[PDB]
């Protein structure tokens, strides 16, 4: 298991434009297109992103292209973040992927607000951090996903993803 397989499990893969859990226009492997309610605006962003006339749809290879780009951005993001970097550098591999997972899903700015969880993760207070992590809109809105990620932070293993 690696970050790509992990995210693939959490985001699924859709070739036509879809509304995500928050009702936002997205496609591929959780590639957010736009926060606006406009399908056309989403269609525009899709074309701009792919660099061709797609008319709301893409291929698997293009999806994977967005995907590779998005994963890289999250990492680069974390590494550039004053608040995220120290935590990220402090984690073992497996746990680091979980941080990437959250950033991919919510953005670096959103994750940077889990101040207390962040500190706990920094201190290696696994169980304590898992509890704090659960006291969030994140967990209340996407419970099964949030559970997998928290379990990962708690155990340092891929178990939450085994057998899926």
How many CB atoms sit inside 10 A of residue 164's CB?
Answer: 8
Per annotation, catalytic residue among 20, 47, 64, 128: 20
Residue 43: which residues within 8 A CB-CB, separation 6 or more? Answer: 17, 54, 55, 56
Residue 116 annotated as lining a ligand binding site: no
Q: For the segment 96-115, give every residue that binds Cl ion (CB under 5 A).
A: none
User: Could you give the residue ranges of the DSSP H alpha helices within 37-125?
Assistant: 39-50, 60-80, 84-90, 93-111, 115-123
Stretch that binds Cl ion, among 59-67, 98-106, 109-117, 141-149 (CB under 5 A): 141-149
Least gap, CB of 9 to Cl ion (angstroms): 11
Residue 32 annotated as lining a ligand binding site: yes
Catalytic annotation on 20?
A: yes
Least gap, CB of 162 to Cl ion (angstroms): 18
Q: Which is nearer to Cl ion, 86 or 107 (CB)?
A: 107
Q: For the segment 59-78, give every residue that binds Cl ion (CB under 5 A).
A: none
Catalytic annotation on 127?
A: no
Task: Say how many CA atoms lie within 13 Å of 153 toward its Cβ.
Answer: 30
Q: At what angle are helices 143-155 and 126-134 packed, to 10 degrees? A: 170
Stretch that binds Cl ion, among 37-45, 93-101, 123-131, 134-142 (CB under 5 A): 134-142
Q: State how far the Cα of 107 lies from the Cα of 92, in Å rounded to an integer.
A: 21
Least gap, CB of 141 to Cl ion (angstroms): 8
Contact 95, 126 (CB under 8 A): no
Token match 């893969």: residue?
13
Per CB under 5 A, does 145 bind Cl ion?
yes
Please pick, from the candidates 144, 162, 163, 164, the single residue that binds Cl ion as defined by CB under 5 A: 144
Active-site residue numbers? 11, 20
């Amino acid at each position: 298991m690696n970050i790509f397989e992990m995210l693939r499990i959490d985001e699924g893969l859709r070739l036509k434009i879809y509304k995500d859990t928050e009702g936002y226009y997205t496609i591929g492997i959780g590639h957010l297109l736009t926060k606006s309610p406009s399908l056309n605006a989403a269609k525009s962003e899709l074309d701009k992103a792919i660099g061709r006339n797609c008319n709301g749809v893409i291929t698997k290879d293009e999806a994977e292209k967005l995907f590779n780009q998005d994963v890289d951005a999250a990492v680069r993001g974390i590494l550039r973040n004053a608040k995220l970097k120290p935590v990220y550098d402090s984690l073992d591999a497996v746990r680091a992927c979980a941080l990437i997972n959250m950033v991919f899903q919510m953005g670096e700015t959103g994750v940077a607000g889990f101040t207390n969880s962040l500190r706990m993760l920094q201190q290696k207070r696994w169980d304590e951090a898992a509890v704090n992590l659960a006291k969030s809109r994140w967990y209340n809105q996407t419970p099964n996903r949030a559970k997998r990620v928290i379990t990962t932070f708690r155990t340092g293993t891929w178990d939450a993803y085994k057998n899926l």
